[PDB]
């Protein structure tokens, strides 16, 4: 009954007069992720007129995670030092942050952003460790995964207020509370939204299926599997808000997570040890959380 939930999701957006938008640069970048031979200076040139976006990009570029110890002070430095993929990634991040800032609701702006940035970054780490060829695509799917909660929070806040208090009082997940109160969730709303924005279906499906990887109706589902894992990981390691049923052992859950099999079926040649990946994440999650929390203050 996804169409029932998808129909309800579209009706839920109908009642909003002015719907959120994303910059053309976000859609442009989203569209070009698979083209290895784009000219870096063309990408760089997109920032030229935008002093605010430019300064944001130089700031993220200079962060340890992007730069290491090398000082990035101009955009010219960022171009030379980041290269095409990390530059697309940094620009995407610095432009999409306006979506997460431009509103208020019952959940704090910073809650949704920090969780989304965490998911993006962890999902990318997984992409890298499992040999996935275009990890920026996983990053972008990750950062957008909960764009539906952003919508409900900012645009149907009066209503989301009730989701929050049902969650806080009966200790169910946001997705469960949404299902009960609205008959649809941020998965379906986020899908409807991303479809309205003309985002590729690899992103749309990640938004739709990220709370149950086992629902994806096709075999090559690496990105979704990566972001679903990253979301559950973040939620279980203090980088989230959506809630989770009680777990006997988190490490064991993460080690046995269904995404690992989905990634292996999608990437026939990839050899990885999910035990060591979970261990690595756990060893760096305090640092990851610090970096996330510090980048932009929303």
Q: Interface residues with Fe ion (CB under 5 A)?
A: 146, 231
Contact call for residue 203 and Cl ion (CB under 5 A): no
Q: Which does 101 bind (CB under 5 to 8 A by kind): Fe ion, Cl ion, none?
A: none
Q: Is 293 annotated as a binding residue?
A: no
Nearer to Fe ion, 56 or 124 (CB): 124
Nearer to Cl ion, 6 or 33 (CB): 6
Taking the complex as a whole, the smallest distance from the CB of residue 186 to Fe ion amounts, in Å, to 6
Contact call for residue 199 and Cl ion (CB under 5 A): no
Contact call for residue 8 and Cl ion (CB under 5 A): no
How far apart are the C-alpha atoms of 205 and 190, rounded to whole Å? 10
Overall size of the chain counted in residues = 298
Contact call for residue 194 and Cl ion (CB under 5 A): no
Chain-centre distance for alpha carbon 41: 27
Q: Is 231 annotated as a binding residue?
A: yes
Q: Is 145 annotated as a binding residue?
A: yes
Q: How far apart are the first and last CA of the chain?
A: 37
> Dihedral sign, CA of 175, 233, 60, 41?
negative
| Residue 242 neighbours by CB distance under 10 Å | 23
Q: What are phi and psi of 159, to 5 degrees?
A: -75, -50
Q: Which does 178 bind (CB under 5 to 8 A by kind): Fe ion, Cl ion, none?
A: none
Taking the complex as a whole, the smallest distance from the CB of residue 78 to Fe ion amounts, in Å, to 29
How far apart are the C-alpha atoms of 288 and 61, rounded to whole Å? 16
Contact call for residue 33 and Cl ion (CB under 5 A): no
Q: Which does 231 bind (CB under 5 to 8 A by kind): Fe ion, Cl ion, none?
A: Fe ion
Q: Which does 192 bind (CB under 5 to 8 A by kind): Fe ion, Cl ion, none?
A: Cl ion
Residue with smallest beta-carbon separation from Fe ion = 231
* Contact between 289 and 295 (Cβ < 8 Å): no
Q: What b-and-e string marks burial along 86-102, b requiring 16 or more CB atoms within 10 Å of the CB?
A: bbbbbbbbbbbbbbbee
Taking the complex as a whole, the smallest distance from the CB of residue 211 to Fe ion amounts, in Å, to 6
Give the footprint of Cl ion on residues 154-193 (CB under 5 A).
Answer: 192
Taking the complex as a whole, the smallest distance from the CB of residue 206 to Fe ion amounts, in Å, to 10
Give one DSSP letter per residue of 77-128, joined into a string: HHHHHHHHHHHHHHHHHHHHHHHHHS---SS-HHHHHHHHHHHHHHHHHHHH
Taking the complex as a whole, the smallest distance from the CB of residue 203 to Cl ion amounts, in Å, to 13
Residues of the shown chain interacting with Cl ion in the complex, contacts defined by CB under 5 A: 6, 192, 195
């Amino acid at each position: 009954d996804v169409e029932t939930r998808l129909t309800l999701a579209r009706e839920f957006m109908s009642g909003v007069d002015e719907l959120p938008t994303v910059p053309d640069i976000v859609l442009r970048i989203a569209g070009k992720l698979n083209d290895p031979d784009v000219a870096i200076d063309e990408v760089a040139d997109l920032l030229l007129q935008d002093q605010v976006l430019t300064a944001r990009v130089v700031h993220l570029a200079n962060s340890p995670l992007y730069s290491a110890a090398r000082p990035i002070s101009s955009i010219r430095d960022a171009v030379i030092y980041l290269g095409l993929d990390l530059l697309r990634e940094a620009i995407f991040t610095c432009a999409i942050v306006d979506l997460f800032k431009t509103g208020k609701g019952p959940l704090n702006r910073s809650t949704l952003w920090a969780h989304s940035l965490g998911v993006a970054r962890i999902a990318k780490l997984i992409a890298e460790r499992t040999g996935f060829l275009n990890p920026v695509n996983v990053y972008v799917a990750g950062l957008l995964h909960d764009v539906g909660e952003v919508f409900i929070n900012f645009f149907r806040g009066k209503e989301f207020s009730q989701v929050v208090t049902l969650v806080d009082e009966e200790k169910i997940t946001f997705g469960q509370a949404e299902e009960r109160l609205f008959g649809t969730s941020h998965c379906e709303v986020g899908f409807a939204l991303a479809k309205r924005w003309s985002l590729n279906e690899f992103i749309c499906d990640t938004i739709l299926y990220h709370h149950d990887i086992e629902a994806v109706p096709y075999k090559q589902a690496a990105i979704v599997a990566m972001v679903a894992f990253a979301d559950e990981y973040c939620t279980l390691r203090r980088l989230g808000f959506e809630g989770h049923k009680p777990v006997d052992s988190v490490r064991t859950l993460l080690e046995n997570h269904p995404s690992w099999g989905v990634i292996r079926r999608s990437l026939g040649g990839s050899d990885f040890d999910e035990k060591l990946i979970v261990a690595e994440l756990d060893s760096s999650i305090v640092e990851i959380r610090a970096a996330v929390d510090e980048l932009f203050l929303l």
